[PDB]
Amino acid sequence: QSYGFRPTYGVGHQPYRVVVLSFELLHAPATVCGPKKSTNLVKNKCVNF
């Protein structure tokens, strides 16, 4: 049923465009990642991976 909007409406009735981001961060091949520079890989030495 109709969901019309009027500018004269006060708070709590004005339209509220919403975008919700769903994440699935888990042990799986990662495709979306942040802007962190990749460094060279080192073996047989203690590092903060």
Binding site: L26, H27, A28, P29
Partner: peptide
């Protein structure tokens, strides 16, 4: 046509992407 059968033991996959060895892990 149509007929019935017994599934035996089958239809088991890897629920998760993590790796295990000599582990008796259980999952729901």
């Amino acid at each position: 046509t149509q007929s019935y059968t017994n599934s035996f033991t089958r239809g088991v996959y890897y629920p998760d992407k993590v790796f295990r060895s000599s582990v008796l892990h259980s999952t729901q």
